[PDB]
Amino acid sequence: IKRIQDDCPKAGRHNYIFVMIPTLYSIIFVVGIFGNSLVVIVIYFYMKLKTVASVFLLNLALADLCALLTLPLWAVYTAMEYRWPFGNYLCKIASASVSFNLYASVFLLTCLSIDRYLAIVHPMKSRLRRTMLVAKVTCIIIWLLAGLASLPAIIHRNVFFIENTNITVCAFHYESQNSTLPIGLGLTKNILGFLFPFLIILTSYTLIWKALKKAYEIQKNKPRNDDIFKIIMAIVLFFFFSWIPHQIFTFLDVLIQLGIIRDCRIADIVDTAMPITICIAYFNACLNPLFYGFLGKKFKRYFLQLLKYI
């Protein structure tokens, strides 16, 4: 247990964070398990994994399920005024579990965006290429790429002894004013985690939007313009407005580390806001079963079949 001093140890230590935040983590954990696990049953039992859509939808549900698994560990760590009683080997894994699954959840949504674009804008030509094998290769490459992005987290994350408060926390230490390797963690979350995934998601669903307008106007036969177009707006905007608070405060923490920001009056709010923005970043994991699942007719009837079998 390395012994260090915390530069400003009163940041984020408020009474209303040690009770409200662990409640939100537990609530998301209960809802997320109930939702995502329900989806995994349906895809394996009723959709039967016969289509490329099933492969992508299964991995997305799996990634959200694994991210929630280690949430209770962080719920009790925050509950006890930021004290880590689990040991180094557990903080090594728990930090990697969140970062690895969250990166895969974002990368998988980008793959669904591209895969949906091919199947809608090019229904004829994509039949030659969109085979089951290509889905398997894409999925494993996604998980491998998420592991390489999560690798700096499993390296730097370590348990420290804070001589200022005699409290054992496990965290990343920015010992240098530059500290280039740890701040590559900060920018990877910002560039490879929000900008590139969102540009692809925005571009693909914009081209899907144009194609459905042209397709629905040509046929002009009982079109349901309302439901298909509401879902596309709901999907794109929810991703943006559930991830943009965390990416803003991640960028601020990068400025704090470089030395651009030094006052602890606003280093207090940054460490105060970060638990909040992580709570609403998990809204994607607990609401993905709705947007990508039961908003369609197929899963609604599958769930009714499950309801009958009680």
């Binding site: 530069d7 969140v98 969250l102 920015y174 010992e175 970060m274």
Partner: peptide
């Protein structure tokens, strides 16, 4: 130095 204790 800066001790970043948050989950992600």
């Amino acid at each position: 130095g800066r001790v970043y204790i948050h989950p992600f």
